[PDB]
Design an enzyme around this catalytic site. Sequence first.
Site, PDB file in Angstrom:
ATOM      1  N   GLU A 119       8.625  21.288  37.393  1.00  0.00           N
ATOM      2  CA  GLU A 119       8.740  20.622  36.095  1.00  0.00           C
ATOM      3  C   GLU A 119      10.182  20.274  35.753  1.00  0.00           C
ATOM      4  O   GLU A 119      11.106  21.054  36.010  1.00  0.00           O
ATOM      5  CB  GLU A 119       8.082  21.466  34.993  1.00  0.00           C
ATOM      6  CG  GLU A 119       8.195  20.992  33.535  1.00  0.00           C
ATOM      7  CD  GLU A 119       7.480  19.664  33.253  1.00  0.00           C
ATOM      8  OE1 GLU A 119       6.984  19.026  34.207  1.00  0.00           O
ATOM      9  OE2 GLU A 119       7.313  19.327  32.064  1.00  0.00           O
ATOM     10  N   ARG A 120      10.367  19.098  35.149  1.00  0.00           N
ATOM     11  CA  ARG A 120      11.730  18.610  34.821  1.00  0.00           C
ATOM     12  C   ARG A 120      12.281  19.405  33.634  1.00  0.00           C
ATOM     13  O   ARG A 120      11.518  19.636  32.678  1.00  0.00           O
ATOM     14  CB  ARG A 120      11.682  17.114  34.505  1.00  0.00           C
ATOM     15  CG  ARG A 120      11.225  16.253  35.673  1.00  0.00           C
ATOM     16  CD  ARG A 120      10.935  14.819  35.273  1.00  0.00           C
ATOM     17  NE  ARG A 120      10.789  13.959  36.437  1.00  0.00           N
ATOM     18  CZ  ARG A 120      11.783  13.280  36.992  1.00  0.00           C
ATOM     19  NH1 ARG A 120      12.999  13.357  36.482  1.00  0.00           N
ATOM     20  NH2 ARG A 120      11.559  12.523  38.053  1.00  0.00           N
ATOM     21  N   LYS A 129       1.801  11.345  36.986  1.00  0.00           N
ATOM     22  CA  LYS A 129       1.254  12.712  36.980  1.00  0.00           C
ATOM     23  C   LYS A 129       1.657  13.525  35.743  1.00  0.00           C
ATOM     24  O   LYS A 129       0.802  14.147  35.118  1.00  0.00           O
ATOM     25  CB  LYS A 129       1.677  13.475  38.236  1.00  0.00           C
ATOM     26  CG  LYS A 129       1.200  12.846  39.551  1.00  0.00           C
ATOM     27  CD  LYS A 129       1.677  13.637  40.778  1.00  0.00           C
ATOM     28  CE  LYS A 129       3.189  13.911  40.835  1.00  0.00           C
ATOM     29  NZ  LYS A 129       4.004  12.666  40.829  1.00  0.00           N
TER      30      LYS A 129
HETATM   31  N1  ADP Z   1      -0.104   6.501  30.751  1.00  0.00           N
HETATM   32  C1  ADP Z   1       1.052   5.831  30.852  1.00  0.00           C
HETATM   33  N2  ADP Z   1       1.229   4.916  29.920  1.00  0.00           N
HETATM   34  C2  ADP Z   1       2.366   4.218  30.020  1.00  0.00           C
HETATM   35  N3  ADP Z   1       3.338   4.387  30.925  1.00  0.00           N
HETATM   36  C3  ADP Z   1       3.107   5.328  31.838  1.00  0.00           C
HETATM   37  C4  ADP Z   1       1.980   6.064  31.856  1.00  0.00           C
HETATM   38  N4  ADP Z   1       1.895   6.908  32.918  1.00  0.00           N
HETATM   39  C5  ADP Z   1       3.027   6.625  33.578  1.00  0.00           C
HETATM   40  N5  ADP Z   1       3.845   5.727  32.897  1.00  0.00           N
HETATM   41  C6  ADP Z   1       5.230   5.356  33.167  1.00  0.00           C
HETATM   42  O1  ADP Z   1       5.619   5.712  34.510  1.00  0.00           O
HETATM   43  C7  ADP Z   1       6.453   6.893  34.534  1.00  0.00           C
HETATM   44  C8  ADP Z   1       5.617   8.145  34.826  1.00  0.00           C
HETATM   45  O2  ADP Z   1       6.475   9.261  34.997  1.00  0.00           O
HETATM   46  P1  ADP Z   1       5.826  10.617  35.504  1.00  0.00           P
HETATM   47  O3  ADP Z   1       4.550  10.927  34.837  1.00  0.00           O
HETATM   48  O4  ADP Z   1       6.768  11.758  35.391  1.00  0.00           O
HETATM   49  O5  ADP Z   1       5.666  10.221  36.999  1.00  0.00           O
HETATM   50  P2  ADP Z   1       5.374  11.237  38.132  1.00  0.00           P
HETATM   51  O6  ADP Z   1       5.275  12.631  37.671  1.00  0.00           O
HETATM   52  O7  ADP Z   1       4.110  10.852  38.782  1.00  0.00           O
HETATM   53  O8  ADP Z   1       6.468  11.219  39.105  1.00  0.00           O
HETATM   54  C9  ADP Z   1       7.147   6.908  33.162  1.00  0.00           C
HETATM   55  O9  ADP Z   1       8.412   6.288  33.256  1.00  0.00           O
HETATM   56  C10 ADP Z   1       6.251   6.059  32.249  1.00  0.00           C
HETATM   57  O10 ADP Z   1       7.017   5.105  31.511  1.00  0.00           O
HETATM   58 MG    MG Z   2       6.256  13.356  36.310  1.00  0.00          MG
END
Ligand code: ADP
Ligand code: MG
Lengths: 473, 468, 469
Positions: B188-189, B162
């Site tokens: 948000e982190r 996300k």
């Molecule tokens: N578009 C992407 N391309 C490569 N890796 C991704 C992508 N989207 C997610 N990831 C991987 O998965 C994780 C996504 O984290 P994040 O976006 O904060 O997850 P969420 O908010 O859904 O909890 C990251 O560690 C990243 O390495």
């Molecule tokens: Mg995230």
Amino acid sequence: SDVGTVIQVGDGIARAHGLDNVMSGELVEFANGVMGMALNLEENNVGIVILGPYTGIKEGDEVRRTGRIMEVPVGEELIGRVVNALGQPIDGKGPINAKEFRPVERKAPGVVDRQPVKEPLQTGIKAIDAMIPIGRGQRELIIGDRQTGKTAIAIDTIINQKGQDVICIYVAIGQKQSTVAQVVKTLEEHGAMEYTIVVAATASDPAALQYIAPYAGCAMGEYFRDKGKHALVVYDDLSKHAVAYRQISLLLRRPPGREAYPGDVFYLHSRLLERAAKLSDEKGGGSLTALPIIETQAGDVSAYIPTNVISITDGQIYLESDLFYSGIRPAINVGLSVSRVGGAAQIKAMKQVAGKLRLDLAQYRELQAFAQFASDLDEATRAQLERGQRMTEILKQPQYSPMPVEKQVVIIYAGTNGYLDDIPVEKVKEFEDGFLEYIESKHPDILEEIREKKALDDELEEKLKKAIKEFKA
Amino acid sequence: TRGRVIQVMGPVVDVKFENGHLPAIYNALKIQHKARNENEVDIDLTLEVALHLGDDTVRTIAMASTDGLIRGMEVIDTGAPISVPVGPETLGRMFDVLGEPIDEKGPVKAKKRWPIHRPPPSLSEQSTEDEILETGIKVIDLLAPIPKGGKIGLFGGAGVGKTVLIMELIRNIAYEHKGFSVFAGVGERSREGNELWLEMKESGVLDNTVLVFGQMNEPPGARFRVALTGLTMAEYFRDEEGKDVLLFIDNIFRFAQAGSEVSALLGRMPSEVGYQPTLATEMAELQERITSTRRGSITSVQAIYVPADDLTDPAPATTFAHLDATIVLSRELAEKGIYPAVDPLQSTSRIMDPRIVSEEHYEVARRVREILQRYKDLQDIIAILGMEELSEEDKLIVQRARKIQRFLSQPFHVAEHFTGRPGKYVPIEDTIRGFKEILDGKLDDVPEQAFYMVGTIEEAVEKAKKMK
Amino acid sequence: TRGRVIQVMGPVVDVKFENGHLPAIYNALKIQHKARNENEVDIDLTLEVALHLGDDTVRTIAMASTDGLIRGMEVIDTGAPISVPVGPETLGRMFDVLGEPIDEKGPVKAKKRWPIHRPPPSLSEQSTEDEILETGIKVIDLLAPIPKGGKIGLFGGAGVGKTVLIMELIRNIAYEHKGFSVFAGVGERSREGNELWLEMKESGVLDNTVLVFGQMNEPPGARFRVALTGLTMAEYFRDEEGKDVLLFIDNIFRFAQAGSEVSALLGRMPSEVGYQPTLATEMAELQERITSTRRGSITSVQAIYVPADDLTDPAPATTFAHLDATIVLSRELAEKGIYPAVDPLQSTSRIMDPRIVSEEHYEVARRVREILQRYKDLQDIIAILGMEELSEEDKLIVQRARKIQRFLSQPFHVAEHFTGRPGKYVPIEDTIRGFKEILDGKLDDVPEQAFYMVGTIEEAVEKAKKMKK
Ligand SMILES: Nc1ncnc2c1ncn2[C@@H]1O[C@H](COP(=O)(O)OP(=O)(O)O)[C@@H](O)[C@H]1O
Ligand SMILES: [Mg+2]
Ligand SMILES: Nc1ncnc2c1ncn2[C@@H]1O[C@H](COP(=O)(O)OP(=O)(O)OP(=O)(O)O)[C@@H](O)[C@H]1O
Ligand SMILES: Nc1ncnc2c1ncn2[C@@H]1O[C@H](COP(=O)(O)OP(=O)(O)O)[C@@H](O)[C@H]1O
Ligand SMILES: [Mg+2]
Ligand SMILES: [Mg+2]
């Protein structure tokens, strides 16, 4: 005395001392000018549900009984306008000069005041008008998952009432102001506003208004029924209406039951949906038909509010998220959907052709469980598979494209008698439009006879006139 | 007019006042106390009025930690709701839930302060614009086009992508429109919020952007009211300045949970899965204000956390009714390495109509959704019987669905640390042309592996050449 | 004596009695108030006592709408439960849950009124003379015979044919058995009460039948007590007239859902899947009063809605215990044109023993269930492989099962208007003789189409010729 004072204020709920002679369901007025309904009567307090912004009410404020039941304006003057749950205008087109007012809570017509429903309410949709018929005084439920086409069936049905004496009432419950405005422009674009009333309790409005909305829309539909005319009432989602009642009942401290809802919730929807009826000739012969809508979470038809409303209605249309992405666009589960009034609702011409379609589809549903292999299936089984695939295609229809009953008859007749069987599965959709343009453009007498007699019996010409089209197109 | 603290129960505090001098609902109260002796601690705290109880007593929600409070402490009434600065002085600044600045830059000195609670636009002020916002993201631009002035929602569990998807949208849209931008960061982190702030401060984009945060570690009063502070600042640019703005929210689920944590302590009866009885009303108070009117426009991208991967949960379930476009992210796609991991069969938008998009776009999207559904309906039959038992038509449908599911993958610029590839931007014309060329079978003699992590179709063909 | 209204919350009302004495449990109370001024509304309401609370106060369930009630209104104790008219004067009349006539024909003027809450017959008053009640319906009389003084249940989903099968059974009893019938519309749809009343008023069957309805739009307290009103009217014909009578109850599922809603309104903890904790006790209070005694007999036909095809739901599951016979109606048979749509493989009865029915009846019904099951075990092979691969014995077994499957179909009189087929009544001797002749392979060179919708087997044999074959 008749003066009470506020002792607690929460999210749209207030409690008051005094008001000794108030009656159950009476309207009450706060000193700020806002209004509320006296729902719970206790030994020492009255539970009041607020009909507006509650942030202006404070502990110690005076509250007075009005001596009046909740009522809404009715008449011909509401046609082609948009109003809130209390009947007040929100379209910006000025005041409403309605001459009569009716309480939103009235008793349904008795067993002896009714007559059997014998005339059709055309939806213009080939899957509903052939296999799931609607009569002019019947309650039919539209049910399925989110984004499957629930409002599209209700709106296409309202648009088809143009050349017919039916007043349409569209009641939006818990909808976004933006989707209400988007639907109203679609109704004006097709001219449906020349006979449509729109009632809307937005998601921003208090739960008390989203609670009153279906009853107000019903009171407006009853006026036309009581005067010998026909009316249609749509409730965009009864699921959000139940949620609005759960909110008020939990905040008023009534004891919960199944799926956290109050025990009173079956009486909520049954006291509403039983008001849709066809009256006897002594009462005037008038009619009111209803199309409530319900949304299911991840396909769970076994849930509390869904099973409750499935048991109240005279038939249900089931929409599948699976059929919708697979390219069966209206997305109706014809092998699960049902109407008790089927046959009696339809015309003599439509019923005849509906019958063969029903057997063909039933047999196809039996065979498709093991249709996975087809190169091994006996050639006879293939005849059943091929016919069933083609009848499925005829039922596919684009949004905002109601087909007239004589044309639905003319096409189902062709598929059921095998005249569309020889056409290739992908080419069937093309052949359907081309055949209907051919029948209307030259020798239009077939379409004229079906409108007048409504019984067919003249097929020799329809067969011979059809062979002239299939000879080269 | 003053009062005294009677009870303290975690995030909830009860206060008693003088005869008839009671504060209204949503009204802000202040606690300012200095330690009288070494056994006490200094406190600076803001409380929000939630309900009237009787006996001149009011129940309230605290905006910061209640540690150190003592029964009998003096409380002051501000006479109005939480009020935050509004205007052009707020551009390029970081803020707290109470509208106070986080950055070391000094006082804002804005000309006016607006209350956090305002009525939404009426039905006659609504707009009906049907304009496509191009994102450059190959899956959204085809299957769920984003309407200008509408709400787009990103639904997903923990770690599906996300935040990576929101930040790629921030980068691509805010580049060419040059309008005013707002980001709320409700969940948000702090680490990501710091990475965002540094890039915006060096690229100059910060000068047109408002930020409000309200971190995960904060009490529920802050997690509950922070989404309204960012929205109240974005409303000024629409209402008083007539501008077109972007409003980003990394988590609206946190806003719902903060109301759930509060509800038991307020004295309310619980509903399904322990949630508050007021859940749909509270989500509508936030979502009905995020709309475009005849004065200006608010377009919004929102992320929604899905607990335990269940979409039937009251918080995600209540939210779907308010969105014009809905994107659902699947673990099955993420675990298979296909990113952004958007589910092609559950993602949809209001704009996906033959009246709003070209015949060629409508036909290509239809053919993509159908071939993927046919492939989903066959993974059982392919498990029970050998693939050599499927018909030629089903055999081709599997190979085309395999190529399509990975041609939907794309390397993002904001993900260069994770993908090991440069990053790509794809125009709508090349997305439609790309999928049409696969659907029509012109690329049957190309390996599935060539379609993974390439931006456009010409790249897939040279990626096939790089492998004999 | 006289009490006063203390609380009002939906269908629930609390009353305080003070001096004299408090009313008993299940006792009926009356509210009769005339508007003292223009700000009030006239009210006519009946309440049923459910529990004692202390402080000379009682909690009650309202039989009609509580709108317009006011705290301090006077309440009167009738000294007994809800009491309804009984006797021959009740024949050919429509009634409300409180026993007041719905129809405009006038007051019933009956000589006696019986209370709705009375004790069932004792173990001594039980009779054991089991026998068979002939329905004239070819599927029930063979596969699931009805015991006199026994209970038969019809299980199924929506649109399978439950109410039409009940309407045809009411007609047949008034035709040849010349008995008195009672129909209890528990939570009845007002659209259907109109169709039952019109079929019976034109076919003449109404003069021998009692109709009790109330409405699906009435509060839950009314939907819960209505099945007892029909039963209390059927008891008089057994006990005071010594006759054998048939009681029809359409959808006891609505009865179970109404007790749940009342328990939730009173504040009881929910049981399995949210039903009332007292479900088995409440079901039994109604099912036990229906029995054959040394004075006479009450037999009963009951319809049960199966929600979402789940027979394990508490409502269907608690009902199975009190059923002598069971009928399951399959939606797949209904849409294939086979009516009454009863599944030959799921229908059963307790009286299907050689000691209670003839050796020829038991042997034929056994041979029918067996050949149908054998055909069910082969329809996969008949579809995937050519029918030319089936053996000579299995090929004949399939054809006989195919004739028997449609021979179970019968045209009803109450359904003649829909299809235009005259309607038929078949006696037990001809049902047994018909299936025996097909099973014994005597009648093989006759086309399957001749056995669909025909009544007796001679009618199938002439029909073969009418179709020129
Ligand atoms: N578009 C992407 N391309 C490569 N890796 C991704 C992508 N989207 C997610 N990831 C991987 O998965 C994780 C996504 O984290 P994040 O976006 O904060 O997850 P969420 O908010 O859904 O909890 C990251 O560690 C990243 O390495
Ligand atoms: Mg995230
Ligand atoms: N027959 C159809 N042919 C093509 N598209 C259709 C058809 N019927 C509906 N759609 C499309 O399906 C989408 C959803 O329709 P609709 O809003 O009526 O569904 P819904 O179930 O009522 O959704 P919601 O639950 O959000 O209210 C719209 O984009 C609509 O244009
Ligand atoms: N014997 C029959 N012959 C033809 N049609 C029938 C027959 N029995 C039932 N039907 C059709 O099916 C419907 C059954 O409805 P209903 O009696 O209410 O079914 P149920 O209560 O089982 O849900 C009828 O209205 C009619 O359309
Ligand atoms: Mg909708
Ligand atoms: Mg039924």
